[PDB]
Every structure is written in C-alpha cells, then in structure tokens.
Symmetry: D2
Subunit: 224 residues, 4 copies
C-alpha cells in the first residue's frame, strides 16, 4: 500500500486479427519521459501530469483514471495534423504504479513505395478531407463536422519526424481524395474500398504505376 | 414419346451475381446451336437446340428420374465417348437436368465454367473507345467432362489475351484461376502508350465468375487503403 | 413526334458485379398497370399518374422526369415497412413512350433457410432498427433520424405477399439487431459484417444452427 | 571466425497482422532449443540456440553473401540430408538469413508455416472456461524442406482436432488449407451439449495466418448479411 503512485504508458488491447495504429505506433513512443498528459480520476477535472517524473497522492475499491495526450489547453473543437490519444486505467488505491492503456483517437497516415517500404523521395502527397471536428472529453471520441469543407492536408514522410493524423470520417470506395505532385505534375490517388475510419484505424498511401489505367475486379459466386 | 429441350441458367444464392445474369445461357445457346447431351452413364450425342427432339429410350439404365448432362459448345467425337484439355477465349457451359421419363420438356440448367471479361469506363458503362486492353493470364487447363469443371495448368506460363468490347459481340472468356492482389496482369494501350491495370484484391475465379476491367485516371499515382480494427 | 406520351416502368442500371434490390425485385413487379405514381418534369409539382392507363401532354431538347412510388400524400418524414422507389428519365419531347428508371430507396429484407431457399415456417423473425427518417423529394434519398430509437419490426415471408423494407442506416458487425421466436423461445440473429445500407441494398436473414456456438474467422497475410 | 544466431521474425506489410505478432518466434525458439540449419546447397545440421556458435567455413561454395535456412522444430536425420510429410498440432517454423562471412551475429527471420488457433470469448479476450472446442480439418500434408511451405493432402479426410486454450501454454497449429464460407468445421461441447461453430467467410489459410474461434450467443438463430451495391 503506497502513498503516491507513478504512471506507465501502455496500449489498449488490439484486434487479434487486425493491426491497430497502436500496433504500428506504440503509445510509449509518443508519450515518453517529460511529456505532459491531462489526467483525472472519474469525476474530477483534468490536471497536467509529467510522465516519468510526477507522482500523485492516492487521496473506493477500484479507481478509474482518464487521460488525454497531448494535454488539454463536456466537448471541445479539434483539427487534424497532430495525433490525439485517450487512455483509461482501473487501479486499486495503494498501488505503486498505474498503467494507462491508451487508444489513438485520430487516424495516422503512412506513405509506402511499391514494395511497402516507407517512402523517401521528393514527391508531395496530399489528402482532401474534413479537418475540423469535436472531441468528447470523457471518452476521447472525435466526430467530424459534417458541415465542414474538405481541406488539403500534406502527408509527412518518416524522415520529417512527425506523423500526419487525420480526424475519423468515412472515405467512400473510388473517392478521389488524394493527389501526388512531382515536378509540377499531379496525379490522383483514390480509395479502393470504403473506410469508415475510427479510433485505432490507420490509413496507407501506396504509390505505384500498378493501377495507371484502372483496376481489375471480379466476383466469385457459388452455384447450388 | 419424345422430349424437347429448353435452355435455362443454373442458380446461385438469391443475393449473388453470376455471369448468367449479364450473359444468359439462352443468349449463347440459341435455335440452331448444337450441344453434346447424355443421360447418366451414356455417351454424349449431338442435339440441335430449338429443332431436335430426343426419344425417351435414350436414358441408359435409369428409372423414375433421369439425369441429363450437356456441353456447349459441342464436344469432339473422341471426348463424347473422363477429362479433356482446354484453352481460353471461347466460353464453355455445362448443363444438367433431372426429368421423369414421359415429360414433354426437359430444362437444362447451364453453368458458365469459363470466366467472361467485361471492359467498363469509370461509371460502370461498357467501354466503347479505341484503346487496346490485354490480360496476362494462364490460358491452358483441363475440363472434367462429367461435371464441366475447369482447372488451370499450374505449370502453364501466363499469356497475353486481348479483351473484346461489348460491341464486338463476342465475350473474351478466361479459364478459372487465382489472381493475386497487386498482380500486374493488365495493360491498356492507346496511341502507342501503355498503362498498367492490376488487381486490387485476391480473386480466386471459378465457374459463374465475372471479371471487370474498370478504366479510369482515379489511381494514377497509387491507392489509398487502410485498416479499421474493431475493439470488441 | 407524338402529342401525348405513355410511361413504362424500368430499373436503374445495376452494379455489374453485385446484385441490387432491383435485380431481386424488378420495379415492373411493384409498379404494375393501375398503380399510381407521383410524377413531374423538372421544376414542376408532382401530380398523380395511373401507370398503363394515363397519358400526358408534351406541353427544350431533352426533358428530365422524376417519380415517386407509392404516390405522395423540399423533404418529408418517412417510416419503414412499405417500399419507396424513385425514378428518373431523360426524354425528347414528341417521344411516344417515356421509360422511368426506378431505384428502390428503402432496403428489402428477405428470410432464407439453411439452403438459401425462401423460409416458410412458423418462426417469428424481427429486427431492431431505426424506423423513422427523412426523404429528399427531389432525389429520393432517405436519411435516418439519428435521434430516433430502435424499434422492433417483424419481417414478412414470401407467402405474406408484402416485402418488409427498412430505412437506409449503418448496421455494425456483431450488432445484435435480430431475434427469432419459435414456441416462446427467442434466439439472437446478428450482423456478421458492417452494412452501410443505401438505396439498392438488400438485407438477408439466414436461419440455421451453423453458428450456434459462435464463429470461425482468420487473416491471410503475405510474408515479404 | 565463428558466428552466433539470433531469432527474429519475418516481415509482412506494415499494416498486416501475422501470427508472429501474437506468437513471436523468440518465444518458441528460446535458449536451449535445437534448430536444423544449413547454408545454401548444404545439409541441415543441428544448432543449439543461445549456446552454439557456427564456424564461418560451413557456408558451402558461397562468397560475398551467404544464405542460411532453418527449420524449427529440428528435422529427422533423413530429412536433414526435397520434401517431407507433416501433420497438424505442433507449430513448424522456417527461417532464412543473408549474412556476410565474418559477421559476429546472424539474424534468422522465421516465418510460421503452420496456422495457430486461438479461442476467444465475445470480447476478443482469451476464453478460460471448461467447454471443449474442436475443429474438423485436414491434418496431413507435405512440407518443402527448401522453402518451408506446407501444402495439404487434398485426398485427406477431415479429422477432429481439439483446440488448446491460451492458459494450456501450447498453441494448436493447423496445416494451411482452404476453409469455405458456412463450412461447419467447429464444435463446442459443454455439459454433454454440442453446438456448431462455422466459418462466416472463405479462408484460404497460408503461412503467417491465424485462426480465431470466437464464442458467443450472437448468432444462435442465424446471421444477418446483405448487399450494398454501388452506383458508379
Ligand atoms: Cl442465381
Ligand atoms: Cl510484419
Ligand atoms: Zn502492452
Ligand atoms: Zn490537435
Ligand atoms: Zn505489398
Ligand atoms: Zn509495378
Ligand atoms: Zn471487390
Ligand atoms: Zn474453348
Ligand atoms: Zn498457350
Ligand atoms: Zn474520376
Ligand atoms: Zn484491402
Ligand atoms: Zn431494364
Ligand atoms: Zn412508407
Ligand atoms: Zn448458401
Ligand atoms: Zn447446418
Ligand atoms: Zn474477416
Ligand atoms: Zn509436426
Ligand atoms: Zn490423419
Ligand atoms: Zn452478445
Ligand atoms: Zn458476405
């Protein structure tokens, strides 16, 4: 039975069959020592907490904690670009450590070359999506403003040291949301399938000449 | 004493699209077309559709109900008498019927054993331009003469097959085979300029399947896809 | 060049690879001779028209027609149950016949047995879905009231002579929307996959004991 | 002069789940475990992981870069010297490495060639109850000793295989094969009462695949599915 407790950054449990954005980008890698989170025990205002440095006083049975990363500056207005994470924990008072299981509420975007390797090159990759929404401060959920206009968002490469995150929204199959510009020449990049993006989702931009003229599709029925 | 034949289509689930929907068997096997037909345990003999009538004695050692089997187009004299080698291009249909001796009409339910290929524009409408569309697929296989099933020669090399437009009035049929996701099987040539057309997903083609080539500039620089995992 | 024109009931062009509810239930079978539709040429109020009986006076170049089936009694409030169809045509004045291409704006529900044959039996099949929405009178589109509560809708068999139609809405994978009652014993029927239902969509209820204990699922990756 | 071995996992696309994610090769091939390892064009010889070191002479006729191949569990003395027959249950891993002679460490990238089976409750959490879960699948195949690939015997009959829970500390592995949609392959028995567990979709299982058995009462009376066609 400890007086104060420390915080550790863990990930929410992923789909056994599908990779989550937490599988691709652990919460530990974003929320490192010295990073500030907004934390609260159920029914308390969010207060800043410095990860790997701060401790909090244990002042029944089990306590539920809630955390936002980055720290907060009810619901709030939000924009895309910077990732937004929401964590929860259930701990017993007196525990030395409290493990927050984070979930990424925004959607990271990765650029891959033809061989699924991370793209490094001079081409500019942009997406035209809704970039304004509302976040629920109690459960972390982001919902796009349906009245919002689609905006051009540039997608960053791994060498840029920041991952472009978009707000959760539905992308329709064949929706021409993307563009690739290389030497003042633009080409379209579209979704092949319907993507109803949510917390834990990842978006991949796959560059190639494989579908230059169009696509091959088909059905596989079964006769009786 | 004798029975007539009617050309019908084999069923699938009520919600599933079959190539029969787009290309009904009755549109291929018209009056004057010849099929190889046999009763179970008997040899395939020619039958002229919309003209011939068959005697109810030609049923083998069947009693109560007779099962008929038919190939379209008709077989060679050697194949009419287990398996045969086949190539792509021309469609191959296999039909079955269950009838009681004495019935005036016998409805043959045809399955399409090959896979038709349709060229569509960006809006799913039949492409009508002057661009050349080709596919690089395996074009040799074996057909089971008793159930109509075609299985590709895995040792076969992929060959270039030109795809006909809807207006050409003949549908390019390919043999059932697996096409892998991202497999660069297609090409579109227009004014000595070629572009690639690839599969977006795995397609394990079988009888009743249809293949669509959907031309557009939508994926000039690549594709957007992603994961939507569920938190159960 | 004709003075008056007759109307013919056709279907909107379907997805070459997927069966539409028009493929399952042609518009011709619903809108038979003697059935009344609300029709208008672009920029005119909808007026009743008796199919296979009425004719209309041709009083530039091409005319666009719009039609609702059943007839109307801007936007309007709608409920599930009875199917709702919306048709359009582009015709040249003087044409003897005008072919309306209809699209089903509601979603039919079919009950199938284990062998995909139409279910005839004594079991009661119900769905718990939103049953109130709004229809666009200019394009036929139905959008569910998000504030609406889910209601129990009984699903009809083919012998009942009426097809249960639901309003377009998203059904999530594993959503326990269905129930089957046979001899005062109820069982759950859930969606296996995400279904973002729209005009042209069909819903199938497949009864069996195949998934009594649960389901088998898996992934098929590809190593580099 | 000598090199050590490290157990790593083979890669797939950054967005795809492999069985390696859930079951890392390093958790199976621990210190003291024996693997059959060979340099290209040479015989498989045993190697004790976390203990042995191999001489840089055992590389065949390679120069510049050497390719290594490894089997886990280790092969029989006859298989160490083209193909072998295999059964389900115990997992089978195949690793490769490309190294330059003189390197102090060689990292073997293991692929899982068999398919692990996990039992989950309604919420994707590992099932911990007393119910018996069985699958009826083909349990005999052939493995390629040069690339690790397992291909099922199509002539094989389906056999009942009991599935172990996560707590049992041994994972039931099945051989790669196609499972058809609606195929009633599974059974759950609890208190002498059996229920069926079937596949909802076609699963053409291969190396790196995982199979999940998700128990619930959600589909007691059947399933809701449907079509959402697009009007392009
Ligand atoms: Cl059918
Ligand atoms: Cl990987
Ligand atoms: Zn963790
Ligand atoms: Zn932000
Ligand atoms: Zn790839
Ligand atoms: Zn390429
Ligand atoms: Zn598809
Ligand atoms: Zn032929
Ligand atoms: Zn050839
Ligand atoms: Zn376009
Ligand atoms: Zn995909
Ligand atoms: Zn029509
Ligand atoms: Zn109504
Ligand atoms: Zn079925
Ligand atoms: Zn059954
Ligand atoms: Zn799945
Ligand atoms: Zn074994
Ligand atoms: Zn056996
Ligand atoms: Zn439940
Ligand atoms: Zn399905």
């Amino acid at each position: 039975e400890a007086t104060n407790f420390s915080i550790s950054i863990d990930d929410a449990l992923s789909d056994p069959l599908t990779r989550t954005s937490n599988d691709l980008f652990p919460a530990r890698n974003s929320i490192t020592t010295g990073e500030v989170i907004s934390m609260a025990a159920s029914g308390q205002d969010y207060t800043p907490f410095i990860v790997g440095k701060d401790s909090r006083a244990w002042n029944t049975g089990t306590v539920t904690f809630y955390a936002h990363y980055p720290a907060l500056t009810n619901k709030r207005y939000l924009k895309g670009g910077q990732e937004h994470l929401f964590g929860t924990a259930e701990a017993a008072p007196g525990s030395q450590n409290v493990s927050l299981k984070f979930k990424r509420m925004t959607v990271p975007v990765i650029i891959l070359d033809e061989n699924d390797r991370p793209y490094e090159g001079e081409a500019k990759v942009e997406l035209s999506l809704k970039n304004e929404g509302t976040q629920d401060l109690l459960n972390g959920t982001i919902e796009i403003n349906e009245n919002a206009l689609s905006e051009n968002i540039e997608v960053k490469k791994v060498s840029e040291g920041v991952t472009t995150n978009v707000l959760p929204q539905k992308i329709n199959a064949g929706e021409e949301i993307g563009t690739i510009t290389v030497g003042g020449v633009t080409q379209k990049i579209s979704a092949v399938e319907d993507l109803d993006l949510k917390a834990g989702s990842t978006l991949s931009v796959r560059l190639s000449k494989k579908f230059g003229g169009g696509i091959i599709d088909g059905n596989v029925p079964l006769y009786r």
